[PDB]
Amino acid sequence: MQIFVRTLTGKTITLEVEPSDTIENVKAKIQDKEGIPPDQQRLIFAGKQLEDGRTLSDYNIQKESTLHLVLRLRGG
Amino acid sequence: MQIFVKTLTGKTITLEVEPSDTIENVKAKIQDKEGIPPDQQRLIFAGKQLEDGRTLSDYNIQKESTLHLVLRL
């Protein structure tokens, strides 16, 4: 299925993923596309923060879904 | 491990904690450092208010995690 990622620039890119894909796998694809290391990526979907270890299906992520890429704050 | 506590205005203190620490212990540490009584402390993590009985590990609060302190009055 194809999903969308709202990148840091306001641009939306498309990814080919499977519901069985992990959040880490999506972050690796986002790293290939946008150059942000996975440990500095936060992915938000429909108000939910996506956790490493989970699959897209765990979050009801479907075709045409849009994830939002957030640069991981410095803490504080 | 070190975690961060940030007020609503963005001011930040740092705490030395353990994953096994309860939210009660964290509020007691905040009271020791800043003098704010635990009954007046509300702590937010991942959009939720944290309950005193659970531990930082129970909420998946890790090192470098940021908690948000709200004055309860």
């Binding site: 939002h68 957030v70 704050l73 | 937010i44 939720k48």
Partner: peptide, 30 residues
Amino acid sequence: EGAQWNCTACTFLNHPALIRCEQCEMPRHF
């Protein structure tokens, strides 16, 4: 307190006490 609110930048569902997004620090829109 109110109900949770979606960040207008990343959609994260924030606590009603917070004035900025917990994830990206976008200020609350109301």
